[PDB]
UniProtKB/TrEMBL annotation, chain B:
PROSITE patterns: PROKAR_LIPOPROTEIN. This is Transferrin-binding protein B. Residues 130-296, 391-530 form the Transferrin-binding protein B C-lobe/N-lobe beta-barrel domain. It is a lipid-anchor. The lineage of its organism: Bacteria, Pseudomonadati, Pseudomonadota, Betaproteobacteria, Neisseriales. Residues 323-372 form the Transferrin-binding protein B C-lobe handle domain. GO terms for cellular component: cell outer membrane; cell surface. Residues 1-127 form the Transferrin-binding protein B N-lobe handle domain. It comes from Neisseria gonorrhoeae. The gene is lbpB. InterPro entries: OMP/PagP_B-barrel (IPR011250), TbpB_B_D (IPR001677), TbpB_C-lobe (IPR035316), TbpB_C-lobe_sf (IPR038197), TbpB_N-lobe (IPR035313), TbpB_N-lobe_sf (IPR038669). Its main location: membrane. Pfam families: TbpB_A (PF17484), TbpB_B_D (PF01298), TbpB_C (PF17483). Disulfide bonds join 356-357.
Length: 688, 532
């Protein structure tokens, strides 16, 4: 199909024509530019179905994302040598020869920014020096109403009319005195670097890849330096100790739906292999007709990695830089609240409403915001919208390998309970003991007798439901093909159309099949343990204590009344079948706990909320026969788990590789070598 | 609370579970604001129109609350009973954003969970009559909706144990469709034995118990017994639990269903054959609003006194001419009921009606009109059958009464068009020889001249340019009042199914129900009381 492109620099719209021209002389897709003056018109046009893609820096991606356009990147550009490629460019502050000024004293000095709301000219620098402008700004936006701080200042693209300072030093010579154009002699890193070479001002706010990209005379370096954050100023090329923001890189965008990661990634990979770094003289896609820099694309850059089908603007832009792009346009007595509200993330309605009751009693110190499945509750705890949740070990893996940490862990009551323990907070965790229970009515079945039968387990991707059993069955078989194992099976959270979600029933009307929330009757521990006892599959793989808490009508409902514990016995690895009461001897394996995952932001704070509105207000110790009941309660295994007889003291295992145990990480790395996951691969993109 | 109608619906009972005081602190001893809620009686949300329109009114109310949510309807069970006219179903939604109202100081004072919905029952064509001889057996289901207390035992045990999915029963109205212990395919059936010898109706109301492994036969526990007393179309009476509940299950079912409904069970047979059944009730502590509905066994053996129409003989009718001409039947309350009343009517705007002399209130007929497709002029015949106890077919009757003629769009005439609202009939009971005068211009001879309206068995053709036809019907005390319509208006006519050459019984948009005739252009509806 005809794939378009949205220029912004139409005088320099020649790295646009040359593209389709010396691609049509090869064969040519029907490309064209649809020019405008400012980029925002391009974001509009693409949202307005008028163009396909234009690359944006940080702040512009943010503005291009939120409603009502919802733009999504596809291809994150790569910066560095063809041997060692990365996509994390930096933003630094260049100065005069000696200068004698540090970044903390810029009162009246004559600055040179690079463009309104860009992450090396405006957002990062402002946020860096924001504790100095001191603007009570519900009225009086930042632009200059508080950028009186500097007396002289150049900031292209600024509204020339409103404020006097923001393009004085911008020598635009006419109505372009202030413009966001290609004809502003002080616009890009090169212009807002000549705004320091000309000595007209001192502090340039630009990338790290220019001091060597436009200073060919390699003796003129030792005077220009980089204004560091750490109260000092170090020589230029040591920038891994002097840079100011590990921002992400200009990332070609395209619409939310029909944005075509595929089409433009295809033509872009052809061009990446054909016209990339150090190649033919047929208009490489990285170069410049001398006089300008980064001409409506990027220059001095090798290529662009592909951004997975999971990443959308909030995820792409990081977490630090996203909190920073937001908490400047809201007042200091507002965005100091957000750093004290533990926005909790539930999964599915029922624990959302448990969470709302909590929010009510919380004293306004714990709000709530929910999601549908732990994949998406992660996709929230990432982009800032909810700073906590709790999940079963296999999910501590799938999450920690997305860049989070475990904070506390549901310290289950291990078999050696023997008492009510008051110091339940600081008794380090013990994992759980995952077993494979079966009904001794049928006596033929042995260990070798698992394949091809009817059997249902407790969860997908959790440790005791889909990865300790099927891991060992893979280690014996070798065919990591997961539906061929069993004839009919109820594993909650897989596809619903397979021969692997045929033995599930769902909800009341019978619609929510295998959905990983609490609406799939046979989901979760008691869920699989329903699927078995109702006699539709043979072997169940579940945590042990459930076969202990589903006799004597311990669920006093229909299905768990009338049942006896002398009616099921365990499996083993040999083939015997002993009595369940001592699963300490012939279980299926050990496994790690669940745990409360969160971010490195707000982790000294989730030791000030959860530590004393669970230890108190909290199921054994101050109230809740009546008010809170945040555990085994009126509700069962929602938002926690109903053996959660405390919350933990994780004791150092922040780096989950230090938490999950080096053996289970090995297991799940052996497993997820045949099975991908919607998240894991995108989030392994987000560590490149 | 027993003023019956076509369709009712109670709305779920969302309880105010917001701890902190309105403006203060946490209503002093640890409680919520509304720590109980029984029902009221400004809530039976009467409905009207087509079943789909009633359902859609409920739907639109929930929509008026919120517009993104999805409604979990009732259909996916009720097919199991193959209903045709009456339904006792449910609507609800659990996609709701709960109502929060906070205070300035951060505190909160109102919190209503999002679960929103109704239970409802809807009937069509109330049974103007009933099977008469022997007993009859209906099968069908019910639905209920309880109050919403906060501790139905005093231990706050999980609201999953006692029956229902979480948060139902303890913080909102415990309900039926959200009950999840039964023979999960069929939860709540019920059976109906009706005996007209004593004009009574007994019924058993059953909640299927639970089978561990989904193979066994059911364990039916009858939860509500029904003793109802007939009154034509409707029936009043009492819903009350059995005692097996109170004895065995004093912790699971004796804890919602625990007070009778004395004189507070209403219902109506629907289908003009009394072959389907609707009803409702509310337990006398206003704690269980429940609506039920059943249906014939489809093996309908006829009754010997053929009261219920629909493959038997009509007894009482409400006949209404449609919009501007044709005639139709409007479903029958079974109730008798207007000169220059300049007040509103249920049709939408200000009825300026003129219906004269009221020395006969049993049968009614004549003119209904209403001023602000359209509705211009209204002829009605609302006539109730005779009470078959007063005065038998031995005697003599002289009827005088009401009369009204219509022609269509051209200028029409009134009761005094005969120079007097006479509609005069002479008949002998012992011979059933209805005759008399229904004047067209003046007298008997300058009118339609057909007489000797004998009655054969139940059927009849009382009559009072050859080969004409006129029909009537009995009203008041036993054979004591008379009246009907001329069966000679146009190609079609007035009264019973239109004589329009008998091509298709309204199987299309043409209306070609019954037998042919010739085309004059004049119609009249008549009635009269006995004199002696
Ligand atoms: Fe940049």
């Amino acid at each position: 199909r005809s794939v378009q492109w949205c220029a912004v620099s139409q005088p320099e719209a020649t790295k646009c024509f040359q593209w389709q021209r010396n691609m049509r002389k090869v064969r040519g897709p029907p490309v064209s530019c649809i020019k405008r003056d400012s980029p925002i018109q391009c974001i509009q046009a693409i949202a307005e179905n008028r163009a396909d893609a234009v690359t944006l820096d940080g702040g512009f991606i943010y503005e291009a994302g939120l409603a009502p356009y919802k733009l999504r990147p596809v291809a994150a550009e790569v910066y560095g040598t063809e041997r060692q490629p990365r996509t994390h460019y930096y933003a630094v502050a260049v100065v005069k020869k000696g200068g004698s000024f540090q970044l903390n004293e810029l009162q009246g000095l004559k600055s040179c920014h690079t463009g309104l709301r860009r992450t090396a000219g405006w957002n990062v620098p402002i946020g860096t020096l924001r504790p100095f402008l001191n603007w009570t700004g519900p009225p009086e936006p930042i632009e200059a109403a508080v950028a009186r701080f500097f007396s002289a200042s150049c900031v292209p693209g600024a509204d020339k009319g409103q404020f006097p300072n923001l393009c004085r030093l911008c020598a635009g010579t006419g109505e372009n005195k202030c413009a966001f154009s290609s004809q502003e002699p002080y616009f890009s890193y090169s212009g807002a670097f000549k705004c320091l070479r000309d000595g007209a001002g001192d502090v340039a706010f630009i990338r790290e890849s220019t001091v060597f990209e436009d200073l060919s005379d390699e003796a003129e370096r030792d005077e220009y330096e980089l204004l560091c954050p750490d109260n000092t100023r170090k020589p230029v090329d040591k920038f891994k100790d002097c840079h100011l923001a590990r921002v992400p890189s200009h990332a070609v965008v395209a619409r939310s739906v029909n944005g075509k990661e595929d089409a433009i990634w295809n033509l872009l990979r052809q061009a990446q292999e054909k016209f990339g770094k150090d190649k033919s003289p047929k208009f490489q896609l990285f170069g410049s007709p001398s006089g300008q820099k980064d001409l409506l694309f990027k220059d001095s850059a090798i290529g662009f990695s592909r951004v997975p089908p999971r990443i959308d603007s909030g995820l792409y832009l990081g977490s630090g830089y996203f909190t920073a792009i937001q908490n400047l346009r809201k007042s200091e007595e507002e965005v100091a609240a957000r750093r004290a509200r533990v926005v909790w993330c539930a999964v599915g309605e029922q624990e959302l409403r448990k969470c709302n009751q909590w929010s009510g009693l919380s004293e306004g110190s714990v709000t709530c915001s929910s999601a549908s499945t732990t994949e998406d509750c992660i996709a929230l705890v990432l982009k800032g919208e909810a700073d906590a949740m709790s999940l079963d070990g296999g999910y501590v893996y799938t999450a920690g390998k997305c860049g989070l940490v475990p904070v506390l862990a549901e310290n289950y009551k291990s078999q050696q309970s023997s008492d009510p323990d008051p110091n339940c907070v600081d008794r380090p965790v013990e994992g759980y003991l995952a077993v494979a229970v079966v009904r001794r009515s049928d006596t033929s079945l042995t260990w070798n007798s698992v394949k091809g039968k009817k059997s249902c387990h407790t969860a997908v991707d959790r440790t005791a439901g889909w990865n300790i059993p099927m891991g060992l069955l893979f280690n014996q078989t070798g065919s990591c093909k997961f539906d061929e194992y069993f004839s009919q099976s109820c594993a909650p959270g897989s596809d619903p159309r397979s021969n692997l979600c045929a033995l599930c029933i769902g909800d009341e009307q019978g619609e929510n099949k295998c959905v990983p929330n609490s609406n799939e009757r046979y989901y979760g521990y008691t869920g699989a343990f329903r699927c078995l006892a109702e006699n539709a599959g043979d072997v169940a793989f579940v945590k042990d204590v459930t076969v202990l808490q589903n006799t004597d009508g311990n669920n006093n409902e229909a299905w768990a009344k009338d049942l006896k514990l002398a009616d099921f016995a365990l499996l083993c690895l040999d083939g015997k079948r002993k009595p369940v009461t001592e699963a300490r001897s012939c279980h299926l394996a050990m496994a790690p706990n669940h745990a409360v995952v969160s971010r490195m932001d707000k982790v000294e704070r989730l030791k000030q909320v959860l530590l004393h509105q669970q230890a108190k207000f909290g199921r054994n110790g101050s109230d809740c026969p009546d008010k809170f009941c945040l555990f085994q309660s009126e509700t069962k295994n929602l938002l926690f788990n109903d053996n959660t007889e405390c919350l933990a003291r994780l004791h150092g295992k922040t780096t989950y590789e230090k938490y999950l145990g080096p053996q289970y990480v090995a297991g799940i790395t052996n497993l997820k070598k045949c099975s991908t996951s919607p998240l894991l691969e995108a989030c392994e993109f987000l560590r490149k | 609370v027993n003023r019956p109608a076509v369709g009712a619906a109670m709305r779920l009972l969302r309880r105010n579970t917001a701890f902190h005081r309105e403006d203060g602190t946490a209503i002093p001893d640890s409680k919520q604001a509304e720590e109980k809620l029984s029902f009221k009686e400004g809530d039976v949300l009467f409905l009207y129109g087509s079943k789909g329109n009633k359902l859609q009114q409920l739907k639109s109310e929930i929509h008026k609350r919120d517009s993104d949510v999805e409604i979990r309807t009732s259909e996916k069970e009720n097919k199991k009973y193959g209903y045709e006219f009456v339904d006792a179903g449910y609507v609800y939604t659990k996609n709701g954003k709960d109502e929060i109202e906070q205070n300035s100081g951060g505190k909160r004072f109102t919190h209503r969970f999002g679960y929103d919905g109704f239970v409802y029952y809807s009937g069509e064509r109330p049974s103007q009559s009933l099977p008469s001889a022997g007993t009859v057996k209906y099968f069908g289901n019910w639905q209920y909706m309880t109050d919403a207390k906060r501790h139905r035992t005093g231990k706050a045990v999980a609201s999953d144990d006692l029956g229902y999915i979480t948060f139902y029963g303890n913080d909102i109205g415990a309900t039926s469709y959200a009950a999840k212990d039964a023979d999960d395919r069929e939860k709540h059936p019920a059976e109906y034995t009706v005996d007209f010898d004593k004009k009574i109706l007994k019924g058993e109301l059953i909640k299927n118990q639970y089978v561990q492994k989904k193979n066994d036969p059911k364990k039916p526990l009858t939860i509500y017994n029904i003793t109802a007393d007939l009154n034509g179309n409707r029936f009043t009476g009492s819903a009350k639990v059995n005692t097996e509940v109170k004895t065995r299950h004093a912790d699971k079912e004796y804890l919602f269903f625990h007070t009778d409904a004395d004189q507070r069970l209403e219902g109506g047979f629907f289908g003009d054959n009394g072959e389907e059944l609707a009803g409702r009730f509310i337990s006398n502590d206003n704690g269980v609003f429940g609506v039920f509905a059943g249906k014939q066994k489809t093996n309908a053996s006829g009754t010997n006194p053929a009261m219920p129409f629909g493959k038997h003989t009509k007894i009482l009718d409400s006949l209404k001419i449609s919009v501007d001409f044709e005639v139709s039947t409007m479903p029958d309350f079974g109730h008798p009921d207007s000169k220059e009343k300049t007040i509103d009517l249920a049709d939408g705007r200000k009825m300026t009606v003129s219906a004269c002399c009221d020395f006969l209130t049993y049968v009614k007929l004549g003119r209904i009109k209403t001023e602000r497709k359209g509705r211009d002029i209204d002829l009605f015949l609302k006539g109730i059958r005779t009470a078959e106890a007063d005065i038998p077919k031995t005697g003599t009757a002289h009827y005088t009464g009401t009369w009204e003629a219509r022609i269509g769009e051209p200028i029409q005439w009134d009761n005094k068009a005969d120079k007097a609202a006479k509609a005069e009939f002479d008949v002998d009971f012992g011979n059933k020889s209805i005759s008399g005068t229904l004047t067209e211009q003046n007298g008997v001879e300058p009118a339609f001249r057909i007489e000797n309206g004998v009655i054969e068995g139940n059927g009849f053709h009382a009559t009072a340019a050859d080969n004409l036809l006129v029909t009537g019907g009995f009203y008041g005390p036993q054979a004591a009042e008379l009246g009907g319509t001329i069966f000679n208006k146009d190609g079609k006519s007035l009264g019973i199914t239109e004589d329009i050459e008998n091509e298709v019984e309204n199987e299309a948009d043409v209306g070609e129900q019954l037998e042919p005739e010739v085309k004059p252009q004049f119609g009249v509806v008549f009635g009269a009381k006995k004199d002696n």
